Amino acid sequence: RKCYQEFAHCYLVKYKTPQPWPNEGLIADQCPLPGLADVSFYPYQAIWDYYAKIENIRPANWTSSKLYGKARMGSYYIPKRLRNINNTHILFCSDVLYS
Amino acid sequence: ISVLDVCSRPEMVLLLNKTYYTFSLWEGDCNITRYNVNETECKDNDHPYSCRLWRYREGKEEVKCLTSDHTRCLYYPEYSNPEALFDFGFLSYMRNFPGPQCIESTSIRQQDYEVYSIYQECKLASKTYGIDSVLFSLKNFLNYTGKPVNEMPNARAFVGLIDPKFPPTYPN
Numbered sequence: 001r002k003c004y005q006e007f008a009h010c011y012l013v014k015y016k017t018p019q020p021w022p023n024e025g026l027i028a029d030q031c032p033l034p035g036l037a038d039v040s041f042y043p044y045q046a047i048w049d050y051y052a053k054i055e056n057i058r059p060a061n062w063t064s065s066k067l068y069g070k071a072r073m074g075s076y077y078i079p080k081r082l083r084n085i086n087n088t089h090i091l092f093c094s095d096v097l098y099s
Numbered sequence: 100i101s102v103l104d105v106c107s108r109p110e111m112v113l114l115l116n117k118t119y120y121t122f123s124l125w126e127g128d129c130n131i132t133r134y135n136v137n138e139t140e141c142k143d144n145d146h147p148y149s150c151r152l153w154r155y156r157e158g159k160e161e162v163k164c165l166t167s168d169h170t171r172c173l174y175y176p177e178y179s180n181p182e183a184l185f186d187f188g189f190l191s192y193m194r195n196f197p198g199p200q201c202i203e204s205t206s207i208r209q210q211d212y213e214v215y216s217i218y219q220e221c222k223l224a225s226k227t228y229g230i231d232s233v234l235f236s237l238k239n240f241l242n243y244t245g246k247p248v249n250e251m252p253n254a255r256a257f258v259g260l261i262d263p264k265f266p267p268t269y270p271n
Contacts, residue, residue: 002221002230002234003218003221003222003225003234004218006221006234006237006238006249007217007218007221007237007241008218009218010216010217010218010241010248011214011215011216011217012214012215012217012260012265013115013212013213013214013215014212014213014214014215015208015210015212016210016211016212017210019207019208021113021114021207022205022207023119023205026105026109026113026121027121027122027123028105028106028121028122029122029124029153029187029188029189030102030103030105030106030122030188030189030192031103031106031107031188031189032185032186032188032189033185034185035183035184035185040185042185042186045106045107046106046107046108046109046254046255047105047106047107047109049109050109054176054180055174056173056174057170057171057172057174058162058172058174059162059169059170059172060162060164060169060172062162062174064160064177072125072177072178073176073177073178074154074176074178074180076109078109078113082110082113082114082259084259084261086261087114087259087260087261088260088261088262089259089260089261089262089263090114090115090257090258090259090260091241091248091257091258091259091260091263092111092248092256092257092258093217093241093248093249093256094253094254094256094257095253096108096111096253096254097111
């Protein structure tokens with residue numbers, strides 16, 4: 001009872017050689033986008049936290065390498081914290097991967 | 100792991116997927132151009148997006164503004180949106196209308212991993228040690244980064260650890 005109530009779905013996976021994400025900007029449009037309305041027709045997706053929304057007001061000397069990196073405009077940009085070279089183990093407690 | 104999962108639980112696909120199968124629908128990629136969409140691979144409906152593309156090429160990154168103030172200035176995207184809509188690729192994924200699409204492969208990870216279950220360790224190590232001590236130490240191990248994994252939502256609960264010790268030593 002105690003072990004199940006605490007750590008029922010907790011697992012730890014371990015590589016053989018540490019290998020992080022090589023790419024900087026993810027290009028994948030399998031699911032819709034918010035558009036401009038606050039309450040979009042589609043439910044709030046988990047990829048919209050990385051969305052590169054189109055901006056209107058920017059200085060003349062603005063560049064696309066300041067914060068969006070090499071990713072194409074309107075694509076999804078991920079931070080460096082998810083691709084550390086020293087990441088060797090992964091821990092997760094969820095049940096969205098069962099058979 | 101299915102294709103759609105990458106935008107429902109992005110962290111697990113980013114941290115666990117071995118092959119990067121990116122889905123390209125924009126114009127320019129995979130050797131598809133506006134002047135050869137018909138002759139390259141739908142041969143010949145009832146939908147405006149049949150054999151149609153999503154993101155078009157209008158030019159390059161340019162900034163033009165001569166307004167009174169220099170702060171609020173107009174901007175030109177380098178990959179223009181001819182419709183500014185949001186439900187093109189999602190409907191294209193359901194195979195309802197034809198159109199260009201290209202899947203690209205990129206290997207990142209090999210060397211098949213090893214999986215350990217924390218619950219099994221909790222069950223097995225509790226037959227020889229005080230179960231309260233085991234529970235406390237395992238909870239401390241789960242809080243290695245200072246953020247409890249159980250606290251973070253079920254959908255997106257994935258953390259990376261730099262050579263943690265498993266299992267930790269327990270007090271006498």
